[PDB]
């Protein structure tokens, strides 16, 4: 009978959480933001087309100098490009051709990759030998890696398909804390600007706000009908946007613990693969499976623009730290820079 | 352009040449994906043919790479899309499991669970034009067990002789009736541990798939 009592208590707690969230909903973003003029029509154009990949591109990350770019392809290749002159700076072969994530260290010294091999490979770029060699092979997950991000040069946050996330110390090579509480595979990560908290979306139609240092699930947001594939964080760290396969993007607030905005249209029936914000937070860019990307007004939920330069599924998006350009990568083996 | 920029351009050209050479080398490659219920002789078929395990071998003048994905006990629709360009799927089923059940089954059998996986794979979004090679493993024990209750538990609607041939034919027909794409074909084979000439069958099936795709491309069909 103890299990029944605990389940009833859990239901009562969920009802209390719902009641608490209801009282805070004294408005909505679309109503408060009705006093500001729209951004108008934004027509972005392709400035660079980065060729060289011979297969699908699965991940892409920008450097902190807004000039270097890293791309991962199922050919078994990571490529570090100069975004300005289209030159190829580095070509790192991989031990496993199945790569679904990549990351660029904030200091510009290290890169990361991972995939179905259940191993996160960290490569060092600044070496005395002149080549790029494997610095670490972090192992300990029981599933594929969906996203990996750097907190510093010795700490990395990974999310895997074994319904968990991990915080790895690179030098030791062992987990410092493990985040559990999801019931399904975790697909995306997004680090807060101050690197003290992060957000993790999973296939159980939920997202969770985790504290890095305490190793505990601070908050749990729901609302999506299907699995969440991509997640991103507002520049101030007080909001985050999630993309699912319901052809719907959702903007949540950390402080109010309530869903704020829903971006969806009747003419869109394809899922979202990558979500990114602008520097000022006014634009929200989301790549869809319909071979294109859409730019929404993040405060009024209007389709401000469409980028339609790809021939297959757009798998990765990125925005430079200075907000100068937006990089898109799709399964047609090409990277495009839009300004 | 300064001298350093010219040297950077030369380095980029060298990188591009290396990538093109690697792609040309990878062009001669036949990729296959191995799937099964997990106890249908997948390890046995791997031994005969010789996270994710890659098996390389070379038969006649072709280089086969088998992808065994059985440790990825997670949602299929989140990582199966990476195998969209696979040439073929080798699906392993156990005939001797027609009445064999597991403690976790809860009144279900090996059948109605392997057939469900076959139906999911055949009707998959990414595998509308990917042919499937089917191996009816453990034919000997299946034939020995059907002396009593020949396909009476798994298929109540079956009516025919208590012979291995007709029961295997009915099961194979049930497996082949799951294909709804005119461009997709299912190649069937009945194997056992004592029949090790199972690699020539895969070679011939791959050749037929390649010829069919080439003829579709040329429009001669």
């Amino acid at each position, epitope marked *: 009978s103890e299990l029944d009592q605990l389940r009833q208590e859990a239901e009562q707690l969920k009802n209390q959480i719902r009641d608490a969230r209801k009282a805070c909903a004294d408005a909505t973003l679309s109503q408060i933001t009705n006093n500001i003029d729209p951004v108008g029509r934004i027509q972005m154009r392709t400035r660079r087309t980065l060729r060289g990949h011979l297969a699908k591109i699965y991940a892409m990350h920008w450097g902190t100098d807004s000039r270097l770019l890293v791309s991962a392809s199922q050919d078994g290749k990571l490529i570090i490009w100069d975004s300005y002159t289209t030159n190829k700076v580095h070509a790192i072969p991989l031990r496993s051709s199945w790569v679904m994530t990549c990351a660029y260290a904030p200091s510009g010294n290290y890169v990361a990759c991972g995939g179905l091999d259940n191993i996160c490979s960290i490569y060092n770029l600044k070496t005395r030998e002149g080549n790029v060699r494997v610095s670490r092979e972090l192992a300990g997950h029981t599933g594929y890696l969906s996203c990996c991000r750097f907190l510093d040069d010795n700490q990395i946050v990974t999310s895997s398909g074994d319904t968990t996330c991990a915080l790895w110390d690179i030098e030791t090579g062992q987990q410092t804390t493990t985040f559990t509480g999801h019931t399904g595979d975790v697909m995306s990560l997004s680090l807060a600007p101050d690197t003290r908290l992060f957000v993790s979306g999973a296939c159980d139609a939920s997202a969770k706000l985790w504290d890095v240092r305490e190793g505990m699930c601070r908050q749990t947001f729901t609302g999506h009908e299907s699995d969440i594939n991509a997640i991103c964080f507002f520049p101030n760290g007080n909001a985050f946007a999630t993309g699912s396969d319901d052809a719907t993007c959702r903007l949540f607030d950390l402080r109010a613990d309530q869903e704020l905005m829903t971006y969806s249209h009747d003419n869109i029936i394809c899922g979202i693969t990558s979500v990114s914000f602008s520097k000022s937070g006014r634009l929200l860019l989301a790549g869809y499976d319909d071979f294109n990307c859409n730019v929404w007004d993040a405060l009024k939920a209007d389709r401000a623009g469409v980028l339609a330069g790809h021939d297959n599924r757009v798998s990765c998006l990125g925005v430079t730290d200075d907000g100068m350009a937006v990089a898109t990568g799709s399964w047609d083996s090409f990277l495009k820079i839009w300004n | 352009l300064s001298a350093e*920029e010219r040297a950077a351009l030369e380095r980029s050209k060298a990188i591009e040449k290396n990538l093109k050479e690697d792609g040309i080398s990878a062009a001669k490659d036949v990729k296959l994906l191995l799937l099964g219920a997990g106890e249908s002789g997948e390890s046995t078929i791997v031994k005969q043919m010789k996270g994710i395990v890659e098996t390389h071998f070379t038969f006649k003048n072709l280089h086969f790479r088998l992808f065994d994905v059985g440790g990825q006990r997670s949602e299929r629709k989140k990582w199966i899309h990476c195998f969209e360009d696979v040439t073929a799927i080798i699906f392993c089923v156990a005939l001797s499991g027609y009445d064999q059940v597991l403690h976790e089954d809860e009144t279900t059998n090996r059948m109605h669970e392997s057939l469900m996986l076959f139906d999911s794979i055949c009707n998959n979004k990414f595998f509308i034009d990917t042919s499937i090679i089917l191996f009816l493993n453990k034919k000997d024990l299946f034939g020995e067990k059907i002396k009593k209750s020949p396909l009476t538990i798994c298929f109540p609607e079956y009516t025919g002789p208590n012979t291995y041939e007709d029961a295997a034919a009915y099961i194979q027909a049930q497996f082949e009736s799951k294909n709804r794409s005119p461009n997709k074909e299912i190649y069937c084979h009945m194997t056992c541990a004592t029949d090790t000439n199972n690699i020539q069958v895969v070679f011939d099936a791959v050749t037929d798939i390649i010829i069919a795709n080439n003829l579709r491309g040329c429009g001669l069909y």
Partner: single-chain antibody
């Protein structure tokens, strides 16, 4: 991380020699190589440059058509074949490693070199500076034309050579600090006038500091400023 040169010595006029350099500890096939000459009364003088493969080969106007650079990636060995030497070609040769990409630090590692006996002008303001330990010093150099390219880079290099040592890179592109060099050294300037500032002078800073232009070949070195206690 190691370059060993060999093949130098005394050669009679009109003869031929072959200097060689063996590389160990780095991916020699991915690095461009330079031969740089130093005479007792001339300072540093660039001899030749060979690219990462067998492409761009550059020679100085005083040696073009007389020397030949060859490369052997499998054995990681570089060769300089010299014919018809004169009293002018008496100097010490240094093999300089140099990798070129965005963010690279060219001229980072210098071999020991071997001693053999038989359009942009860079000017050093002073040949020596009286210095004392624990004080800050400034060394000034001038160029005949602006080294600030349109892309914002200023291709000026500051190297250090202590008595009995091969030069090591101090500053590349007039502002950056090479690996292994403490934050004591700094650099600034604009246009054609540049200044290297040493905030705190130690015993290891005594020696000759050289300026190099790398905007377009040939690369010209200055006379060199000698800081001595």
């Amino acid at each position: 991380v190691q370059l060993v040169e060999s093949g130098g010595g005394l050669v009679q006029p009109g003869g031929s020699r072959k200097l060689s350099c063996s590389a160990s500890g780095f991916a020699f096939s991915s690095f461009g190589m330079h031969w740089v000459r130093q005479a007792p009364e001339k300072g540093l003088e660039w001899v030749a440059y060979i690219s990462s493969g067998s492409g761009t080969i550059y020679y100085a106007d005083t040696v073009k058509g007389r020397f030949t650079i060859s490369r052997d990636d499998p054995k990681n060995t570089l060769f300089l074949q010299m014919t018809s030497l004169r009293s002018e070609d008496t100097a010490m040769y240094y093999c300089v490693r140099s990798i070129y990409y965005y963010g690279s630090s060219p001229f980072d590692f210098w071999g020991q070199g071997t001693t053999l006996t038989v359009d942009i002008v860079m000017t050093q303001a002073t040949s020596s500076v009286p210095v004392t330990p624990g004080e800050s010093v400034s060394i000034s150099c001038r160029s005949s034309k602006s080294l600030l390219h349109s892309n914002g880079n200023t291709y000026l290099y500051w190297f250090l050579q202590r008595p009995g040592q091969s030069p090591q890179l101090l500053i590349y592109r007039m502002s950056n600090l090479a690996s292994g060099v403490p934050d004591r050294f700094s650099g600034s300037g604009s246009g054609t006038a540049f200044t290297l500032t040493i905030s705190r002078l130690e015993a290891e800073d005594v020696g000759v500091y050289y300026c190099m232009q790398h905007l377009e070949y040939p690369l010209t070195f200055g006379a060199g400023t000698k800081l001595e206690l």
